[PDB]
Amino acid sequence: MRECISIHVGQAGVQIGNACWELYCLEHGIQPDGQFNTFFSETGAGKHVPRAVFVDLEPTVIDEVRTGTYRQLFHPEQLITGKEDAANNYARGHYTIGKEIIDLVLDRIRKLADQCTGLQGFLVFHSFGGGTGSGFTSLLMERLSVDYGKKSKLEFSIYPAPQVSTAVVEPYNSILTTHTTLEHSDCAFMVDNEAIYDICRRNLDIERPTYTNLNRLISQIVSSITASLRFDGALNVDLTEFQTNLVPYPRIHFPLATYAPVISAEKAYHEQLSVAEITNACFEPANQMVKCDPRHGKYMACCLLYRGDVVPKDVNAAIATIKTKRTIQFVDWCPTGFKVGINYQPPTVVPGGDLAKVQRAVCMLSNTTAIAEAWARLDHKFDLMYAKRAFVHWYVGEGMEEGEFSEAREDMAALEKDYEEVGV
Amino acid sequence: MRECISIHVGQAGVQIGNACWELYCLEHGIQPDGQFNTFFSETGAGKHVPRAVFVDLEPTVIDEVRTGTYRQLFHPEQLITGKEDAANNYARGHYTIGKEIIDLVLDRIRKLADQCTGLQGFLVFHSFGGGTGSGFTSLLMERLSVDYGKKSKLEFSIYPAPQVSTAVVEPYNSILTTHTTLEHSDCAFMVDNEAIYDICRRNLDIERPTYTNLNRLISQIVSSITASLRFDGALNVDLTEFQTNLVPYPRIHFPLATYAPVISAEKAYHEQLSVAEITNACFEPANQMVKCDPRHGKYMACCLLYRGDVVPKDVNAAIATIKTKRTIQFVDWCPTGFKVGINYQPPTVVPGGDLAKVQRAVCMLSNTTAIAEAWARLDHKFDLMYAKRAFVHWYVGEGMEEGEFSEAREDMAALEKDYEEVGV
Amino acid sequence: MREIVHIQAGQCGNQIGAKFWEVISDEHGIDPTGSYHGDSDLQLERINVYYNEAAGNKYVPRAILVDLEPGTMDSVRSGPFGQIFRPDNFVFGQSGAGNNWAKGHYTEGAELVDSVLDVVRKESESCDCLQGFQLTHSLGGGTGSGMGTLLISKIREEYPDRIMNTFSVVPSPKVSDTVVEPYNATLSVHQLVENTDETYCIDNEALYDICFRTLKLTTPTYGDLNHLVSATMSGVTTCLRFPGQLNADLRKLAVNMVPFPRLHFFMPGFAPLTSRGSQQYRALTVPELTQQMFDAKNMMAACDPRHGRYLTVAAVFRGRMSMKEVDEQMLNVQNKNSSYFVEWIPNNVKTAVCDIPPRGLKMSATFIGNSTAIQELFKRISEQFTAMFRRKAFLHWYTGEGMDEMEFTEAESNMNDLVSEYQQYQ
Amino acid sequence: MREIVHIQAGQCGNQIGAKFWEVISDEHGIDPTGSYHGDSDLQLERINVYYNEAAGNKYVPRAILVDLEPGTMDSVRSGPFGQIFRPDNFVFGQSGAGNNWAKGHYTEGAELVDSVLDVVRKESESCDCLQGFQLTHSLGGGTGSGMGTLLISKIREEYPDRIMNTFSVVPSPKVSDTVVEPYNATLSVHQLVENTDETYCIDNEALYDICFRTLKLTTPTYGDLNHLVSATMSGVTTCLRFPGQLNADLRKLAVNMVPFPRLHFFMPGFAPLTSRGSQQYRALTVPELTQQMFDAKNMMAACDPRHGRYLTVAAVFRGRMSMKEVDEQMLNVQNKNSSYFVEWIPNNVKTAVCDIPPRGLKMSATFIGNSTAIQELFKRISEQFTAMFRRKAFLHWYTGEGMDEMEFTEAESNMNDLVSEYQQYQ
Numbered sequence A, B: 001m002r003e004c005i006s007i008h009v010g011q012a013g014v015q016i017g018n019a020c021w022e023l024y025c026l027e028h029g030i031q032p033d034g035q036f037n038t039f040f041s042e043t044g045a046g047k048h049v050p051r052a053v054f055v056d057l058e059p060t061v062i063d064e065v066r067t068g069t070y071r072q073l074f075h076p077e078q079l080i081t082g083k084e085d086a087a088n089n090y091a092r093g094h095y096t097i098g099k100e101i102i103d104l105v106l107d108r109i110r111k112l113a114d115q116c117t118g119l120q121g122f123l124v125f126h127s128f129g130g131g132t133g134s135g136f137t138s139l140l141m142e143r144l145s146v147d148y149g150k151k152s153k154l155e156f157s158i159y160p161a162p163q164v165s166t167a168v169v170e171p172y173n174s175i176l177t178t179h180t181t182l183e184h185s186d187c188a189f190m191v192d193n194e195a196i197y198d199i200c201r202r203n204l205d206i207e208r209p210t211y212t213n214l215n216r217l218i219s220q221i222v223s224s225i226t227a228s229l230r231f232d233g234a235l236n237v238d239l240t241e242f243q244t245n246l247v248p249y250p251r252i253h254f255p256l257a258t259y260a261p262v263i264s265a266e267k268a269y270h271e272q273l274s275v276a277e278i279t280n281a282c283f284e285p286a287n288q289m290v291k292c293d294p295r296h297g298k299y300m301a302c303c304l305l306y307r308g309d310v311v312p313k314d315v316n317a318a319i320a321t322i323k324t325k326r327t328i329q330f331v332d333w334c335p336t337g338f339k340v341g342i343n344y345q346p347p348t349v350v351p352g353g354d355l356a357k358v359q360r361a362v363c364m365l366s367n368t369t370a371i372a373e374a375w376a377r378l379d380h381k382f383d384l385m386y387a388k389r390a391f392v393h394w395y396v397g398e399g400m401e402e403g404e405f406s407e408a409r410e411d412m413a414a415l416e417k418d419y420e421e422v423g424v
Numbered sequence C, D: 001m002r003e004i005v006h007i008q009a010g011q012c013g014n015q016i017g018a019k020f021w022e023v024i025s026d027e028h029g030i031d032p033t034g035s036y037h038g039d040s041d042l043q044l045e046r047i048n049v050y051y052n053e054a055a056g057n058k059y060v061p062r063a064i065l066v067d068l069e070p071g072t073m074d075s076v077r078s079g080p081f082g083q084i085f086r087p088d089n090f091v092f093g094q095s096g097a098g099n100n101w102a103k104g105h106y107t108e109g110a111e112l113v114d115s116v117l118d119v120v121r122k123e124s125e126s127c128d129c130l131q132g133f134q135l136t137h138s139l140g141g142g143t144g145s146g147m148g149t150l151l152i153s154k155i156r157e158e159y160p161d162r163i164m165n166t167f168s169v170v171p172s173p174k175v176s177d178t179v180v181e182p183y184n185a186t187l188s189v190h191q192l193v194e195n196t197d198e199t200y201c202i203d204n205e206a207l208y209d210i211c212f213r214t215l216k217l218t219t220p221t222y223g224d225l226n227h228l229v230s231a232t233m234s235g236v237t238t239c240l241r242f243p244g245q246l247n248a249d250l251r252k253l254a255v256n257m258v259p260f261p262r263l264h265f266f267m268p269g270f271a272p273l274t275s276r277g278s279q280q281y282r283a284l285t286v287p288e289l290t291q292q293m294f295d296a297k298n299m300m301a302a303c304d305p306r307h308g309r310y311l312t313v314a315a316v317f318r319g320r321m322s323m324k325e326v327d328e329q330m331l332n333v334q335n336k337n338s339s340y341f342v343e344w345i346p347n348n349v350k351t352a353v354c355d356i357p358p359r360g361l362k363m364s365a366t367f368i369g370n371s372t373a374i375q376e377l378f379k380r381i382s383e384q385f386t387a388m389f390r391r392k393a394f395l396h397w398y399t400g401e402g403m404d405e406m407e408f409t410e411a412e413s414n415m416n417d418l419v420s421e422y423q424q425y426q
Ligand SMILES: CC[C@H](/C=C(/C)[C@@H]1C[C@@H](OC)C[C@H](O)C(C)(C)[C@@]2(O)O[C@@H](C[C@@H](OC)[C@H](O)C(=O)O1)C[C@@H](OC)[C@H]2O)CO
Pocket: C117, C118, C119, C121, C122, C125, D290, D291, D294, D295, D296, D297, D305, D306, D333, D337, D340
């Protein structure tokens, strides 16, 4: 049967993973003590065990998981630990400390694969900017590529925001990650914290958020992406289809991920929440989950994942309407720029949560030239930093070389050029 | 189906809107918690939600609405708020503060339009003289014109009285509004507070009134205007018909609005309240809801909206009688100067109210050269004020220019000339 | 939205301010320890206009208390509501001001003003949407007059698009309280003409008249006079803090009351003011209240309003009342006595109404008049000043602090120009 | 994993250390007899970072106490938490250091240092994964400065791939505490430039300012100043000892705070610091805390931060808070006042958050700033040093211990180079 393996790497990734697992449990009625095959590997005592890899170089987040509510759910191995974190240092992830743990991780992955009779591939959770999530993740991905080749390697990545950050070596790390996951990862789905905060401010009418809320939101999106593997419905999408439909050229593979309706209990009753409306919301500039205007960019390819009550006719109508709008610009070379997925199973509400129950929800994954601007900004930042050789002694002092940075910059430039070409 | 969207702007407008919504609820049996399509957009839980836009730059009136009885009825968006009011300053509405909020309002309007399958157009409630109701409303109207074009834009406007006022920059603002809603609004229906007070003194036999009563009276008129969209009856009038029937020339589009019978419980029993009598009352100088004598002016076009028990024969007879009177002067060029609308549904009584139950009621909308005098008076006032350049530093200090005033005056003069021509 | 920052400067300014904070506190149901004990939700809805909330449902007035000498503020702290203020918002110097505008504006005050500005900035940063500043001071002394003016100058420079309004206690024609009063007043007024949006002119002689002639009070205390002033002050901002039928605002009032930028000196009044003996004898009708409001004997400036014309008057009514009645009364006053209202501004009276009346009254009203009669005050001050300056009497106290003759002449010129302007519309 | 070894050297170093161990003990629920009396499992989970466990659930700080004279350590032992330390971890000599860097570094200290190194080795052998060393000392004396520097040199040579961080009490521009301070400080600083990964610069004058201006404390004790320092110290390592949303680390902070290897001198701060009188008057919001953090008056070095630019700042927040809010505040500071942040490093502020707040507070924060303003301290020291050295004043005390003129010149050269480097980014 259809089976996939999750990998959660870092602090952020692990946090996201916790939320995801909670959501999954809520969906499939599994208790916190383990009392589906797609995600939960079943054993001979009416016990369901997640099929995930949990990795951190700092033993803190993992320790929390091990002590908390869902400790009996997880295996005592899936949760892997180290001794000291990378500390926002790609070099300490990719070269120095990662090559101590990576083997174990690989072994675990192999074991998990062995336990499956049709592994669709991988879902990986990391962060552009973090020390572990940048370098270690990259290393892992390379190894996976070497091993499996034609198994799906999907990534969920926390992109650094333009006007806000939490680390002053974040441009370097991200750039390095981009350089060394450009020839491995098939899809890298993007979420941005600033964007999420903006969404919270606007749609939810909440202006005192925290990381937990963000994680929950991310988990919803993840669930939507993966809902076709675990339930019936017209147009059952696969993990392998995304690659086919959202990657026109192999270097160009960063699509944005957005969710609608993200709305509180008060204006759920006021709104109709029809299909068309939701679709419209999905394409609105402010509702997007990154800091980019899709008015400044042409949509190459979009993928829509309707979940709940949806008459396909209505969906079609909505799509037609979207096409009609002047705006919402598409590229010349992609007329058919839509993929549609439908599930009978509705979204699931998490107790003590932000979101209310809905009849129908939609998740949109869109690959566009709007991200080019973001990339350019990042490059500029990098240039500003690297011109004075700031922080370079840390990276060079653990493995890296002067020249690698230059190469990375060149690669970024090439990517930008490609994007520009696509735009024409 | 037939659908229209209400817009309520200012303090006064918002107050009026509250009353209107109460009246609507009473009519259609909707509870204060939402438990028709023409005004109430229906959602999937046996809940009815108004289809209105509520706008104020000062967050006080809106806050009151949000806390009061009908808080659950309204959406948490339809009620829009700002931070600081215009303070009787057209310039702070039209130029400075309005261009912060206007976009949001436009978006809301668009959303509402999208939710309709046959938008008849708009009903807007503001005030000539107020800071927000003058400038902001004008701005909104212009935007609407730019967007929709051939959607009906009806206005309900509180005209400043001649011998009484509540603000000593009221001539300026009103003039500005007139200048910038002369090429946008199709109809601007008029009510005057002094006139209403006079009516209360005379017909109702009440001489301790308040704003609430006035608002209720206005709401009755509004209901009468809109009763044909929501009930059956011979001669079902539309919002689009008013424009056709009451606007002989595009600049000339201010008709007076009057209601009969406005009478208390004591002399409801004494009076017969026949159709003819009511019609006669409608054309009487003192009963009119503005400070103008229609003996000093020719009626261009009149529209009568009979509501309740009415034999059309009786109505015809009444009209004939009216025509006979020497008122009651009509223009040479408009022989057919009557439009007749009838509804089987009677008027609805509001608990703790001024008015008693009646069999039949009539609302008259009349476009006449009597308003020319009022306009002239206003112009004179403006001239008296502007000759010394009084208050101009406030307006000029936020956007306006010396010259705009002159232009406005010229426009007013032109309007007066047109009216004079029509009179001949 | 609509936060107001209060500054109280010098002896009189701090004293009036204490009373004002008491009154506002009682209106909002706030006890001296910053706890709320009200009965209505309306009490808290707009509490943010004057108060800042702290841990444990504590409310702290956005008030800055300024003096060059510690005595008055020590007394304030010792007082009933004194413990409600933020300790860090007392800003004081050590040397007195000697009823000397130069010491307040140029020397002693110059040393302290930066510290005050820092506190002001801190408070303004806590405002979601700061409306503006309210200042309380005297015009005749050194601190309130010199230091106060200086503060105003600084704040207007930094926040030129906010409202700057003052309650300014002025000298009285009969019985001056200091010898250099004319000098100080003229020096302050010069600065206020150019740096404030509105100034409420309070005359202690008028207050005494009110106490004796109207209230029948044998033995008025400064406390009692202060109370009256506080009541007027509260009236002005009522429409920011409560609902109504015609919701006024500071800015709105300014728009309707200032037809030319320099003419922003108002005569305040309050109603009803009735003796404790004759309370049951009066019928509390809106007409009667209106009559009280427009009675010269119920004004708080050193003017005969009948010796000039009203350019504009703003009336703010509090309680339940018929808008019909109010409007009719306003019409009647203007029609009957059109000679007392400038003819070039039709509808010289603006009305606002707030539903929630002050404690112990069903109805009340506050009156704000921009009358050309105010010129008399200025003219009298100018005469006094010139009487001294032409002999350079007392001048060494000011030249010793670095002021020059030319400044005094400039001040005189400004004053005279103002008077001329007023005479135009008279 | 992540064990930290503490070394406290000389009088000030031992005194500050005592307070630090008290504070940490109370945080972990450890009583003076090494018994745990906590209420949460979080208290013990990472107790190994600072403590070693012994028979009978006894916890013993991994602390090495060093002095050339016995007095101070005798006092420490006599003190409240003094009995918690391992007796074998007191390492002392018999002859004093006479405020003489040469005696600490080359002669008296040289005789004792091997014994200290042996103890250090013993402690490091008990670490599953030793993170690094924390040193507490003064820069102006003989023992903490000379001996302390020497120890640092030795340990870095032996453990060059571990973190070496110091809390270093420096001389203050107004009121020096010894005559040879400039010499000692320069000699220490020379060594620290090359042998430490980060140094927190503490100025006693700044502490006194904090106590008087901010805390409103009439009579601060050295104990009280020490407390503040201890609080800052604890802040730095909070993320090793407790869970969080953004788990920081020493190494992470170093990575984000040191853009060039020699520029590793930080100005520490702590928040909130509020007077006992005015506690209820403050609303404890993250914004307000941020404002406190960035206020020059709340810094613990002898700098005006406004006289330079921030290269990087690390903020560590403790308690429950909205990450959204924190990030927004950080953005606002940088956008509003971009001139105070070096333009070549976008996102100059790094934030970390630990869920568990310190005792008696719902929220707190610790501030670590790498500002080019620090150059002023160095420049002033250099001026002082040169003033003496050009006359060879007091020099015989050092040449008598075998030091040569050339060393002093080298030290001066280093200092000047450092200053020049700082000026580059200014
Ligand atoms: C951003 C880095 C930073 C630079 C500046 C200028 C920062 C910015 C702001 O704080 C964040 C100032 C702040 O918003 C206030 C105005 C409320 C305030 O705190 O400013 C200080 C004086 C100011 O320097 C002038 C302060 O010392 C300071 O450091 O300010 C007086 C104080 O009295 C209560 C109060 O008025 C240095 O680290």
